[PDB]
Design a protein around this ligand. Structure first.
Ligand SMILES: Nc1ncnc2c1ncn2[C@@H]1O[C@H](COP(=O)(O)OP(=O)(O)O)[C@@H](O)[C@H]1O
Ligand SMILES: [Mg+2]
Ligand SMILES: [Zn+2]
Lengths: 172, 526, 196, 93, 89, 529, 193
DNA sequence: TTTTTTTT
């Protein structure tokens, strides 16, 4: 990821459920109440960019990352059952990149395997759609709608490549 | 055949993989056995909900076969389940009927259907012969009804029993030669038979119409609906107007015009969903966990917890703390005694406030409605005396159930009750007082439970309650009805600059509320 | 939270990036969100004041080892997050400005911040410095499309009068067509006078 | 066969006449529907004499007829005042 | 709408196609005229089939003022019961 | 015979695999793409087929019922050849046609057109629900148990009566499980209103579509259709057979914001007098009525609806009351420009629902005269608007009240309003003359308003909060020394939200409060009348 | 920025064209530049000049493709069809493809682009019926695309082996394949501690 | 449609 990567910044903006392991004062503003002091075991969802570092530092870290819904057992079950049908966009805009960030934060091999599967399976149909140039179908429309931001970007790129190929090839 | 037995043993292996299924089966078997033991005077049905994901993981091939070709996988699966149960089951001293019962074990699935998940409108012929699930609201629930499946017959003069089973499209996923549906009258040898009812086995057949969700219903389109053949335990698991998701095998039937007798042959085959399991969708009944019960117990330890709970109610609304407490008690209701002689002792509370326009009394009733477990919302003009209590309907002529009949053990609320027609008010009198409704119109004498709690709202006779004038002057309702009714809360507006500013700030902060996820300019969706 | 304003700013940056990319033709960049930047800067200044007061309290030693540790670290992290957001937005605008410079300037000032306008002017100066001197023989600002066609027929889209050429003169007369080598009139085509 | 053609030059006088009628309605209620009725009945006048071009006389008869149909309103209230106001618009020529 | 089978039939107002619709004795008829006068067409959703029938026909009306001898006092509209929209159209 | 059918199939295969224009096998590519999206169906232009060879087109016209299935089989074979590697299944493909030739009016259709590929158009009046059609069947013989199957087409068969390896009169039976079926709809079409002869009932006719042609349109939609004039022996006259049409193809006569739209809306916001431009833009023909224009803007913009954690919701739909045809034109314009609206001045297969007002949701609901409107009594509107509400009205729409002729419903409605320039009257007369013989487009306001209400959600600023509190308490105290209650305060707050939403400010401003109270007073002064 | 985004990580079809024209090709000159032992000269730089100044009418020779096209735009040159561009050759390649579904045929790395160019500006030279050649090329394209999809089915982090895939197809599929490989590698690496 | 208690 690039320090000036828009998508990276936006993904880092996304917050995750977390819980404190210390009762720090003068931090209630995190709870939108600067007057109040943070308490130990305080279940708070925090920005990824922040939550990450807070998890790193602390030994007992100052905060714990709770298992987010996007990586809930239900989510993996749905992924394994049917990757394509899954509306990754609904569960999150930047699900993939954030999953990679999670795996980097915690080396969760099974999660990586599931993500790799999902990626390949959905990429197959993404390529099918992008190649099916119209000489906006509803099927590819819904596939796009379920498409994630990164998936959307790659689809746009591939579709443009195919469009240029056709344009230069069929036409002078 | 060979594939069928192979699938049977494969599902046996699957069951072995997750003892939880076998553990639940044993719990069912032991539970029913102990129920039968010492019956001073319900039995768990032989059915299991196997997690679909478990199958997908243990053997993706079998899982896919089930989802796509249920007619060829579910049968052997349930066969294996029944065999495992029986072998594992003790089945001690089974009754003669139990011997002939052959009561098998059914299967069911939970969640993770993916594409197979659908909706009545989104259903498609392609899905035919594939296990699928859909969601909708139940309508036109057909009545329960028995259905012959076996015709146990005793061969008199020979001392023997010759049973015959019966086939139907609904009964069996796979297509089979239809049974003649004729009771064996005489033995194939020639000895006359006798229909040994009871020993012969029957099943409960039900038909229901689940329609697409009106919320999902596209504009200018009548919501499509599909029928589900509920059977056995599945029968009577719902009723009309029940938003529910069901799982079944979407199946085709009939000749669809293909029959020679058909002349036009411009018709299509009939289709149905042999529901295997039904999942009711309240979105009701609240749920509790031991941790929550302990929290409640500790909370009761708090002294003024009554006050805390009352304040928790209508937090948006301000100033009616006493009315909030009254609503709290009402929701708690009280004890309704009923003497052995038969006398009925109302234990329910009724709450009503005469208030100025925009007093939020209507808003307060709205809050009580939504928070209530089971409530009935209506209004003076919008309500009808028969519509509120009951209306004799031509249907044999039946009796339509009014609001009071609905939510009989729940609560009810009325807006602008003062505006209610006095005839319907005297209609209410009996409902509320006797806690029951009786109708003898159209030559139909009837009596109905009517113990639902009632919380009306009204504006004074003069719009603004004149404290100078008598409450009787300010109240159009007869004192009998008032005395009939429980708790009169006269709420009056006042220009108390301090109080006016208090509520102004309250409402301003209310409008300033922020969804934690959302921000400024982001439209939604002590 | 402090990061909310940066999130809004980066959302605007993403929107403008998609604006430029989706539109095949070059699009003038949107207005600089001076208000949002000023608000974020005010937040940063407030965080600076908070850090200074936190150091003061550390000299007071009010549970500094843990409380001041955490508070200082979180303040620094929020400030860094805001820094990154502002940097990303500004860099995206800078890159689009560079694209504009290369595309046309080598060949909407109000929307640009005065710093942005100065930077764009400097970038144009730099480009003209590059194409001037060594490597001048090739026109870096020239089209990146390969010159497949030696000769192209062209119809003057907009009349502009006669124009000069190394060895000729072209009379730009509305609805008049010319058959001339592509290279000679490529600049005019880029200027929109010439069609096809 | 007959499809009257409205006389724009005359329709200017029609405009100012309708404005006068509006003023008097404010004095004591005309509508654009009245203008359209005047136009339609002028066309009908043209048709009765097989005129595919509406003439000023068609418009004069239309004005008189529509003004009368307005007069039928409010007899004892204003009939006399309306009569005095429109004696030239409806009967004057 | 009646079985032919299942079929609809038009109405007298519809039957009037550029033809004067003589009528008098001025309910449902009133709203039918309303829709007719506003636009010379007849909308209908009978049997859940929304559609319109362009009458495009002239109309002629007659009646007794307020069901009695005309009254010079009170305006013509007051001398009748027709809604002002009806009168204007 | 079968050889000739194979020859026709080969000819169509050659047409598909060879028909090329310029340098593109348009049909080959189209088939490949349609397969790529799993849309197993091809569309063919008749002109193209004629160009390839007139003979095939003519043969098709002669016997469409049989030729078409052969063409679909050819399509299937070509699809298999191009999408699945040979020596290394697909369903029958739907064939779609487009003649684009001279039409035939619905009424004109008669015996002459029987079995002929017809080309026509109309407006679809109704749409049935899809039904099963057995493309393929699995068939068991009842006694000897001989397996077999049938492949049926949706053109021009019945279960065989003979054993085919006495066994019985019809020993065969259907195995629904192995059998395969498709979807089939039924649509009814009426002649174009124009096409209707003088003072004649509009003729009507019924069709059937299947495969991908299913669910392609909705009732009340003008469309042009191509199909074979067909007749079926309805079970419902001697030698009289019911005529229908098999839909070969459909074309729609009538047939979200991009970067440009959002940019335009942003620039509109950049404008300082944008609100003033709007007010100038609503019903320009209705000169004056400035407060009316302002209230129209507010109502069109709605308000920041909020749901409290306790659950109780804050309404966002403002409701305005107005008090001849001037207001009628105003409401007509409002509904025209409104993204969604319901205009009605009070005049207003076994299924029943709520009244017309119930069906209205979102958008707006306008009524020219409440003083005239009394259907279902006021109380229905009282509930439907105050509460936004088996018999529950789950609708949420702003109500634009208006009544030229002269309480509780006034307490319900948020704003209240009423309503000589002779020169504008002259101008209007001249406009009528011409037709008989800032500025912003209605569509532009529609898009802008919907975009804003979709994206914005203003919030009262704290300073605005104190201003509102002080203003309300001061008004009430002034009333005391001389009624404004929480209803009016909520109305003012929602007006302020509407103003901020116009400015797209995520937060409000005391400017919005000032303007909102100014407007609300206008309702107050009218309320005085 | 000095390079448009669409050019950032690939070549547009036009660049593919250009690189193709950089190649030589058989041609039959209709002019005789070769001056007899008994004058304007080319004198090129990026390519040979010896041949150009020795053109002899109806004498086969090689020239860089773009020069050949320049002359062909005039009547003064004729472009000799490459041998692989022959009905026999195309049929043989098709049969090989059907014989070896796993593997691609050994077509010239620039077969698609070269064929398109010749078809557009060399229809006359082609001895075989041009329509048949276009059709066979299209069929080869279809088969190769199908095999491309089959190979995509096995996309993996480790590596890929396109083998005989043509340059045009490679440029067509560059972005998708590269991006997918990048994401997969990112995921797997993140899994690594 | 017409006649018809009965309820709404
Ligand atoms: N004391 C109060 N606290 C909070 N809100 C109030 C209060 N009094 C009035 N309101 C507001 O006034 C609005 C209108 O009240 P409403 O339910 O119409 O009163 P009523 O039923 O007396 O007409 C409600 O939305 C409510 O929020
Ligand atoms: Mg109320
Ligand atoms: Zn047989």
């Amino acid at each position: 990821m690039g320090y000036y990567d828009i998508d990276d910044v936006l993904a880092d903006g996304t917050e995750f459920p977390c819980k404190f392991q210390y009762d720090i004062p003068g931090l209630g503003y995190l709870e939108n109440n600067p007057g109040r002091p943070i308490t130990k075991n305080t279940k708070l969802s925090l920005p990824l960019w922040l939550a990450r570092i807070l998890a790193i530092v602390g030994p007992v870290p100052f905060v714990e990352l709770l298992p987010p819904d996007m990586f809930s057992t239900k989510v993996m079950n749905a992924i394994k059952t049917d990757p394509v049908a899954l509306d990754l966009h609904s569960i999150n805009s930047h699900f993939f990149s954030l999953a990679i960030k999670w795996i980097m934060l915690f080396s969760e091999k099974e999660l990586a395997n599931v993500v790799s599967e999902l990626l390949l399976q959905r990429a197959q149909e993404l390529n099918h759609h992008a190649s099916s140039l119209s000489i906006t179908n509803i099927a590819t429309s819904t596939f796009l709608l379920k498409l994630e931001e990164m998936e959307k970007e790659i689809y746009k790129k591939s579709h443009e490549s195919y469009k240029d190929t056709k344009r230069w090839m069929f036409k002078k | 055949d060979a594939v069928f037995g192979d699938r049977v043993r494969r599902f046996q292996e699957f069951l072995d993989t997750f003892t939880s299924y076998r553990d639940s089966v044993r719990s069912i078997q032991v539970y029913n056995s102990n129920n039968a033991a010492n019956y001073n005077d319900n039995i768990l049905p032989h059915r299991i909900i196997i997690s679909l994901d478990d199958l997908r993981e243990f053997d993706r091939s079998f899982w896919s076969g089930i989802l796509v070709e249920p007619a060829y996988f579910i049968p052997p699966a349930e066969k294996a389940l029944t065999d495992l149960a029986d072998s594992m089951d003790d089945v001690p001293h089974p009754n003669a009927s139990a011997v002939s019962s052959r009561h098998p074990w059914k299967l069911s699935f939970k969640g993770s259907f993916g594409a197979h998940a659908l909706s009545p409108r989104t259903l498609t012929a392609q899905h035919l012969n594939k296990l699928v699930s859909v969601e909708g609201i139940v309508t036109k629930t057909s009545l329960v009804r028995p259905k012959l499946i076996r015709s146990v017959h005793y061969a008199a003069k020979t001392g023997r029993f010759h049973y015959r089973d019966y086939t139907d499209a609904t009964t069996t996923l796979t297509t089979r030669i239809p049974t003649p549906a004729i009771y064996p009258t005489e033995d194939t040898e020639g000895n006359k038979l006798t229909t040994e009812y009871g020993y012969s086995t029957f099943i409960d057949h039900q038909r229901i119409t689940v329609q697409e969700m009106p919320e999902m219903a596209p504009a200018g389109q009548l919501p499509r609906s599909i029928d589900v053949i509920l059977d056995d335990d599945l029968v009577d698991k719902t009723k009309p107007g029940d938003r529910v998701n069901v799982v079944g095998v979407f199946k085709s039937l009939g000749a669809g015009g293909m029959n020679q007798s058909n002349s036009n042959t411009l018709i299509g085959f009939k289709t149905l969903i042999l529901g295997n399991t039904v999942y009711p969708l309240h979105a009701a009944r609240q749920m509790l966990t031991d941790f929550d019960i302990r929290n409640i117990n500790k909370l009761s330890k708090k002294k003024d917890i009554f006050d805390i709970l009352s304040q928790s109610l209508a937090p948006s609304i301000y100033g009616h703390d006493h009315i909030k407490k009254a609503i709290l008690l009402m929701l708690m209701g009280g004890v309704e005694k009923n003497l052995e002689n038969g006398s009925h002792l109302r234990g329910d509370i009724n709450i009503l406030m005469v208030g100025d326009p925009s007093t939020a009394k209507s808003q307060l009733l709205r809050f009580v409605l939504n928070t209530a477990s089971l409530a009935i919302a209506t209004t003076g003009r919008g309500s009808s005396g028969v519509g509120l209590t009951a209306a004799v309907t031509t249907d044999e002529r039946r009796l339509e159930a009014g609001a009071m009949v609905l939510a009989d053990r729940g609560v009810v609320c009325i807006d602008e009750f003062d505006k209610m027609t006095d005839v319907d008010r005297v209609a209410i009198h009996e409902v509320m007082e006797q806690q029951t409704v009786t109708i003898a119109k159209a030559g139909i004498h009837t009596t109905l439970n009517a113990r639902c709690s009632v919380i009306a709202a009204a504006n004074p006779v003069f719009g603004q309650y004149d404290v100078n004038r008598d409450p009787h002057q300010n109240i159009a309702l007869p004192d009998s009805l008032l005395s009939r009714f429980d708790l009169l809360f006269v709420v009056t507006d006042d220009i108390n600059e301090i109080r006016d500013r208090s509520i102004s700030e309250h409402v301003l902060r209310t409008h300033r509320y922020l969804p934690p996820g959302y921000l400024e300019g982001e439209p939604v969706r002590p | 939270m402090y990061g909310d304003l940066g999130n809004k700013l980066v959302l605007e940056a993403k929107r403008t990036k998609q604006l430029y990319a989706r539109s095949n033709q070059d699009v003038n960049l949107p207005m600089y969100h001076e208000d949002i930047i000023r608000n974020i800067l005010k937040e940063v200044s407030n965080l600076r004041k908070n850090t200074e007061y936190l150091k003061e309290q550390q000299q007071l030693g009010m549970l500094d080892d843990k409380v001041a540790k955490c508070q200082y670290f979180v303040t620094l992290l929020c400030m860094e997050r805001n820094k990154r957001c502002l940097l990303a937005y500004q860099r995206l605008r800078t890159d689009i400005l560079d694209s504009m410079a290369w595309n046309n300037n080598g060949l909407d000032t109000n929307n640009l911040s005065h710093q942005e306008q100065e930077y764009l002017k400097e970038y144009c100066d730099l480009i003209t410095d590059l194409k001037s001197g060594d490597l001048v023989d090739i026109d870096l600002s020239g089209s990146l499309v390969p010159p497949s066609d030696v000769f192209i027929d062209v119809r003057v889209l907009k009349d502009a009068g006669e124009i000069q050429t190394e060895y000729g003169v072209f009379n730009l007369i509305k609805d008049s067509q010319f058959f001339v080598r592509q290279s000679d009139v490529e600049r005019l085509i880029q200027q929109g006078y010439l069609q096809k | 066969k007959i499809y009257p053609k409205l006389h724009q030059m005359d329709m200017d006088k029609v405009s100012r006449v309708y404005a006068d009628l509006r003023r008097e309605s404010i004095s004591t209620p005309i509508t654009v529907r009245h203008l359209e009725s005047i136009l339609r009945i002028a066309e009908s006048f043209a048709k009765m004499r097989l005129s595919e071009f509406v003439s000023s006389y068609d418009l004069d008869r239309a004005i008189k007829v529509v003004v009368d149909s307005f007069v039928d309103a409010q007899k004892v209230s204003v009939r006399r005042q309306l009569r005095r106001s429109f004696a030239i618009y409806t009967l004057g020529h | 709408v009646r079985k032919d089978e299942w079929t609809l039939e038009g109405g007298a107002l519809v039957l009037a196609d550029k033809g004067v619709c003589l009528i008098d004795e001025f309910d449902q008829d009133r709203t039918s005229i309303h829709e007719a006068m506003e636009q010379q067409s007849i909308s209908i959703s009978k049997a859940g089939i929304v559609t319109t029938l362009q009458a495009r026909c002239s109309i002629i009306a007659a009646a007794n003022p307020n069901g009695g001898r005309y009254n010079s006092t009170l305006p013509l509209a007051q001398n009748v019961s027709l809604t002002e929209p009806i009168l204007s159209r | 015979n079968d050889d000739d059918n194979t020859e026709i199939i080969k000819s169509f295969k050659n047409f598909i695999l060879e028909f090329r224009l310029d340098s593109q096998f348009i049909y080959r590519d189209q088939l490949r793409n349609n397969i790529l999206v799993k849309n197993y169906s091809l569309t063919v232009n008749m002109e193209h087929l004629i160009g390839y060879n007139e003979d095939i087109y003519k043969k098709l016209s002669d016997e469409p019922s049989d030729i078409i299935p052969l063409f679909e089989t050819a399509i299937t074979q070509v699809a298999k050849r191009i999408s699945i590697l040979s020596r290394a299944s697909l369903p029958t493909f739907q064939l779609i046609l487009n003649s684009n030739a001279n039409q035939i009016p619905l009424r004109d259709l008669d015996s002459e057109h029987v079995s002929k590929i017809v080309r026509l158009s109309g407006i679809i009046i109704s749409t049935s629900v899809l039904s099963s059609r057995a493309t393929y069947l699995s068939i068991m013989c009842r006694n000897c148990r001989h397996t077999t199957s049938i492949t049926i087409n949706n053109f021009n068969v019945s279960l065989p009566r003979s054993c085919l390896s006495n066994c019985g009169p019809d020993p065969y039976i259907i195995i629904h499980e192995s059998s395969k079926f498709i979807d089939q709809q039924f649509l009814k079409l009426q002649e174009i209103p124009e096409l209707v002869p003088v003072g004649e009932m509009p003729r009507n006719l019924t069709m059937t579509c299947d495969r991908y042609l299913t669910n392609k349109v909705i009732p009340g939609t003008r469309v042009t259709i191509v199909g074979i004039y067909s007749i079926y022996n309805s079970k419902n006259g001697v030698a009289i057979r019911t005529p229908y049409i098999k839909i070969l193809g459909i074309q729609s006569d009538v047939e979200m914001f991009t970067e440009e739209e959002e940019e335009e809306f942003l620039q509109l916001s950049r404008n300082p007098k944008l609100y003033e431009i709007l007010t100038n833009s609503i019903a320009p023909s209705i000169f004056g009525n400035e407060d009316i224009k302002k209230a129209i803007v507010c109502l069109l913009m709605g308000g920041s609806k909020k749901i409290l954690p306790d659950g109780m919701r804050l309404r966002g739909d403002i409701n305005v009351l107005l008090l001849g045809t001037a207001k009628s034109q105003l409401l007509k314009f409002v509904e025209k420009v409104s993204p969604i609206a319901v205009y009605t001045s009070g005049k207003g297969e076994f299924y029943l629902e709520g009244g017309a007002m119930v069906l209205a949701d979102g958008g707006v609901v306008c009524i020219d005269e409440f003083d005239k409107m009394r259907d279902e009594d006021r109380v229905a509107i009282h509930e439907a608007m105050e509460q936004q509400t088996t018999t529950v009205l789950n609708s949420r729409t702003s109500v634009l009240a208006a009544a030229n002729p002269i309480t509780t419903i006034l307490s319900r409605f948020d704003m209240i309003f009423i309503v000589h320039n002779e020169e504008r009257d002259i101008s209007i007369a001249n406009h009528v003359i011409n037709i008989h013989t800032s500025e912003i487009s209605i569509e532009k306001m529609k898009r802008y308003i919907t975009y804003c209400r979709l994206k914005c959600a203003p919030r009262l600023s704290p300073q605005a909060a104190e201003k509102l509190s002080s203003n309300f308490v001061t008004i009430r105290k002034q009333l005391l020394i001389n009624p404004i209650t929480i209803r009016q305060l909520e109305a003012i707050i929602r007006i302020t939200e509407s103003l901020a939403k116009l400015e797209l400010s995520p937060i409000a401003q005391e400017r919005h409060v000032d303007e909102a109270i100014r407007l609300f007073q206008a309702s107050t002064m009218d309320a005085a009348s | 920025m000095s390079l448009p985004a669409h050019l950032q990580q690939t070549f547009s079809p036009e660049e593919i064209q250009f690189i193709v024209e950089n190649e030589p090709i058989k041609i039959f000159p209709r002019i005789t530049t070769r001056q007899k032992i008994r004058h304007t000269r080319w004198q090129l730089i990026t390519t040979d000049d010896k041949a150009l100044n020795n053109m002899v009418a109806m004498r086969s020779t090689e020239v860089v493709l773009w020069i050949a096209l320049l002359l062909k735009q005039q009547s003064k040159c004729s472009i000799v069809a490459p041998q692989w561009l022959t009905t026999k050759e195309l049929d043989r390649k098709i049969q090989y493809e059907k014989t070896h579904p796993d593997r691609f045929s050994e077509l010239p790395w620039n077969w698609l682009v070269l064929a398109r160019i010749l078809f557009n500006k060399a229809k006359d030279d082609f001895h075989d019926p041009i329509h048949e050649l276009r059709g066979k090329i299209q069929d080869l394209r279809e088969i190769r695309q199908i095999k491309v999809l089959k190979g995509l089915k096995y996309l993996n982090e480790s590596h890929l082996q396109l083998d005989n895939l043509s340059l045009l197809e490679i440029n067509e599929l560059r972005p998708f394949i590269t991006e997918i490989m990048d994401k997969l590698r990112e995921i797997h690496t993140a899994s690594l501690t």
